Every structure is written in structure tokens, then in C-alpha cells.
């Protein structure tokens, strides 16, 4: 009968997510760190981690 | 104990949106109207805008 409008209480955005939780994706590959003897730093690829 | 089930009021649809407002896109190029000479209207590019 009487419209009693106070606005609504919304100070926080409400977000929805990906069914899995993590967004996009990009392949990546593990590396290690053979010392950089006398020089900077090497950077090889370890074999323990699937690439 | 006793169910007064009569559905719900949903004449409107609800809709989320892209965190920033617009989701896809499509690069574009400014084309200032370097109009034609005499008859047919030609075009060109502008350097005032970005690319």
C-alpha cells in the first residue's frame, strides 16, 4: 500500500568465480640453477618435473 | 512442518557482468575524413589519435 524505499544495503561487491577456481592458464616449464661459474648464472632445465 | 509453497516472484532476469564492464573488444584505427576531391569521397588516416 505504501512504498517505503530506503535503498538497499550494499557496500561490498559480490563476485562469482570459475567452477575450478583458477583462471586462465599457460603452460610452463621447470628450470634449475647450475652455478654461473666465474660469470652470471646458468639456467638449465631440470628433469625431475614433468615439463 | 506445513508447506505454504507458491513458487517465487521472478518476472525479471538477473545478470552478472564483466568486472570492467565490456568483455571482448577489437582494435580499431582512427580514420579522419580526408574527403574526396570533386566527386568520389576518399579516406585516409590520422595521427592525432593513437593507432
Amino acid at each position: 500500500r505504501i512504498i517505503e524505499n530506503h535503498g538497499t544495503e550494499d557496500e561490498l561487491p559480490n563476485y562469482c568465480f570459475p567452477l575450478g577456481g583458477i583462471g586462465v592458464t599457460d603452460t610452463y616449464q621447470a628450470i634449475k640453477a647450475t652455478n654461473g661459474n666465474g660469470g652470471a648464472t646458468t639456467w638449465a632445465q631440470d628433469n625431475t618435473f614433468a615439463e | 512442518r506445513i508447506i505454504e509453497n507458491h513458487g517465487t516472484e521472478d518476472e525479471l532476469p538477473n545478470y552478472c557482468f564483466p568486472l570492467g564492464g565490456i568483455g571482448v573488444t577489437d582494435t580499431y584505427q582512427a580514420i579522419k575524413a580526408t574527403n574526396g576531391n570533386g566527386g568520389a569521397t576518399t579516406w585516409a588516416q590520422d595521427n592525432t589519435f593513437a593507432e
Partner: protein, 58 residues
């Protein structure tokens, strides 16, 4: 190119890698290997080199 949703699926060698910049990555998930990706990609910066048939006697 590498837009959102887009890359939330799988690449297509006509869809993306031709009419688009086809940087790489999306050029590499179509095969997922090393056999064809290199050779294939080499022909879109400046073209294919075996078009000219440079080498002699097979």
C-alpha cells in the same frame, strides 16, 4: 589473437593462426609437440623457404 574466453578452449589453425597475429603458443597448442610447430610457424613472418626450391639435386 590471445583474447579472453577465446583461449579458454582450444586453438584452431584457421580460426586464429592466419587472420590473426598468431604470436606462437596458440600456434603450438594445435599439435602439442615439436614436429610441425617450428616449420609451420616459420612461414608467417616472411613466408616459406621451400617455395623457391633453393637446394639442388633433391
Amino acid at each position: 589473437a590471445n583474447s579472453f574466453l577465446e583461449e579458454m578452449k582450444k586453438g584452431h589453425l584457421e580460426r586464429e593462426c592466419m587472420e590473426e597475429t598468431c604470436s606462437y603458443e596458440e600456434a603450438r597448442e594445435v599439435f602439442e609437440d615439436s614436429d610441425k610447430t617450428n616449420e609451420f610457424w616459420n612461414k608467417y613472418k616472411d613466408g616459406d623457404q621451400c617455395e623457391t626450391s633453393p637446394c639442388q639435386n633433391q
